[PDB]
Design a protein around this ligand. Structure first.
Ligand SMILES: Nc1nc2c(ncn2[C@@H]2O[C@H](COP(=O)(O)OP(=O)(O)NP(=O)(O)O)[C@@H](O)[C@H]2O)c(=O)[nH]1
Ligand SMILES: [Mg+2]
Length: 168
């Protein structure tokens, strides 16, 4: 029974917590309450293989911290989340990508690029093409999500990260 530490990272307000709570509790949280650090555990069967998921929902910090060093070191896989309505959050994907690899001292590491809030079509500023161009640059999977009901790709996103970790 393996444990996967899945770490959800990204700029403030991109929907890290909403995605995590949608995954665990199947509810959309409309409030924006900034996270310090929250941990969610589940014993679950994915692709006929039981696992413990230890999901770490992180703070929306841009600057580096000891907290971030700790979770970048221990994480077994990362969701790098941006909001399609927030261009800066997308630009900053490179910073997260760079730091994870530097902390791990590796050329690659399990991660998925998550383009969140795609339900907000009238506010969307980062296109699917832009997202795919970024994911292709890093040779990592790209997925579009929405935490709002009805949710889009939320289970798939977390399960796909587990699949990437297992398919190493
Ligand atoms: N329409 C829509 N709103 C979303 C979506 N995901 C999150 N939100 C909203 O965006 C706001 C910020 O979400 P939140 O989950 O707190 O983001 P966060 O990345 O965890 N923030 P922090 O970095 O401060 O902890 C909330 O008002 C939340 O309801 C989404 O997919 N669609
Ligand atoms: Mg949060």
């Amino acid at each position: 029974l393996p444990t996967y530490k899945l770490v959800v990272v990204g700029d403030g307000g991109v929907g890290k917590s909403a995605l995590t709570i949608q995954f665990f509790q199947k509810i959309f949280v409309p409030e924006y309450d900034p996270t310090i650090e929250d941990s969610y555990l589940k014993h679950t069967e994915i692709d006929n293989q039981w696992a413990i998921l230890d999901v770490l929902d992180t703070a929306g910090q841009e600057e580096f911290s000891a907290m971030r060093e700790q979770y970048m070191r221990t994480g077994d896989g990362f969701l790098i989340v941006y909001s399609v309505t927030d261009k800066a959050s997308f630009e900053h994907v490179d910073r997260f990508h760079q730091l994870i690899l530097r902390v791990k001292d590796r050329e690659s590491f399990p991660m998925i690029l998550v383009a969140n809030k795609v339900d907000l079509m009238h506010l969307r500023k980062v296109t699917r093409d832009q997202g795919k161009e970024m994911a292709t640059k890093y040779n990592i999977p790209y997925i579009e999500t929405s935490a709002k009901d009805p949710p889009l790709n939320v289970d798939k996103t977390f399960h796909d990260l587990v699949r990437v970790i297992r398919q190493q």
